[PDB]
Design an enzyme around this catalytic site. Structure first.
Site, PDB file in Angstrom:
ATOM      1  CG  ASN A   1     -10.635   5.697  -0.638  1.00 36.64           C
ATOM      2  OD1 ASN A   1     -12.375   5.619  -0.277  1.00 36.64           O
ATOM      3  ND2 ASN A   1     -10.056   5.947  -1.310  1.00 36.64           N
TER       4      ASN A   1
ATOM      5  CD  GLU B   1      -2.934  -0.363  -0.346  1.00 33.63           C
ATOM      6  OE1 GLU B   1      -2.785   0.099  -0.878  1.00 33.63           O
ATOM      7  OE2 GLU B   1      -4.283  -1.606  -0.035  1.00 33.63           O
TER       8      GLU B   1
ATOM      9  CB  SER C   1     -11.988   8.215  -2.717  1.00 33.33           C
ATOM     10  OG  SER C   1     -11.660   7.192  -2.943  1.00 33.33           O
TER      11      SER C   1
ATOM     12  CG  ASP D   1     -13.445   6.634  -5.938  1.00 27.85           C
ATOM     13  OD1 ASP D   1     -12.432   7.397  -5.778  1.00 27.85           O
ATOM     14  OD2 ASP D   1     -14.363   5.430  -5.293  1.00 27.85           O
TER      15      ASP D   1
ATOM     16  CG  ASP E   1      -6.487   5.090  -1.216  1.00 29.87           C
ATOM     17  OD1 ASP E   1      -7.520   5.101  -1.435  1.00 29.87           O
ATOM     18  OD2 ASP E   1      -6.229   4.359  -2.725  1.00 29.87           O
TER      19      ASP E   1
ATOM     20  CG  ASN F   1      -8.831   5.396  -5.031  1.00 26.57           C
ATOM     21  OD1 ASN F   1      -8.726   6.009  -3.839  1.00 26.57           O
ATOM     22  ND2 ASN F   1      -7.591   4.252  -5.570  1.00 26.57           N
TER      23      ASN F   1
HETATM   24 NA    NA Z   1      -4.837   1.476  -2.570  1.00 26.38          NA
END
Ligand code: NA
Ligand SMILES: [Cl-]
Ligand SMILES: [Cl-]
Ligand SMILES: [Cl-]
Ligand code: NA
Length: 129
Positions: free
Chosen positions: A59, A35, A50, A48, A52, A46
């Site tokens: 998120n 990650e 959003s 969409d 992280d 992301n």
């Molecule tokens: Na991720």
């Protein structure tokens, strides 16, 4: 902060992740590796809209507030910046909520795709824990 592998393992263990929801410490270290590369300041945008945040790439659509994720919630009750701190308490405490949400660690796509079913022990090898 970029954690060392064993350094992160020790911190996660103190904060009660080892065997949280039945997931061994190595699972969490592996998830953090893929990650964030163990970097608390990691951020990923992301598709969409959003984002992280942090060592466990929490998120903004569900978990933290960043003020720019329309229709999103803040179920951990924190600014997403809390998640970028050198101290991992906020990230670990939110992670406990996420893993408790129904699908266990599958909530982290990278865990499912890269850690799940592997020799996750290896990630705590050598650590004096
Ligand atoms: Na991720
Ligand atoms: Cl393990
Ligand atoms: Cl928002
Ligand atoms: Cl589970
Ligand atoms: Na949010």
């Amino acid at each position: 902060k970029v954690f060392g592998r064993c350094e992160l393992a020790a911190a996660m263990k103190r904060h009660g992740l080892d065997n949280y929801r039945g997931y061994s410490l190595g699972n969490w270290v592996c998830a953090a590796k893929f990650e964030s590369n163990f970097n608390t300041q990691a951020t990923n945008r992301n598709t969409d809209g959003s984002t992280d945040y942090g060592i466990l790439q929490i998120n903004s659509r569900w978990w933290c507030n960043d003020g720019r994720t329309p229709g999103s919630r803040n179920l951990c009750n924190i600014p997403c910046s809390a998640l970028l701190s050198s101290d991992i308490t906020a990230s670990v405490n939110c992670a406990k909520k996420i893993v408790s949400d129904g699908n266990g660690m599958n909530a982290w796509v990278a865990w499912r795709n890269r850690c799940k079913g592997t020799d996750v022990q290896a990630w705590i090898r050598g650590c004096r824990l």
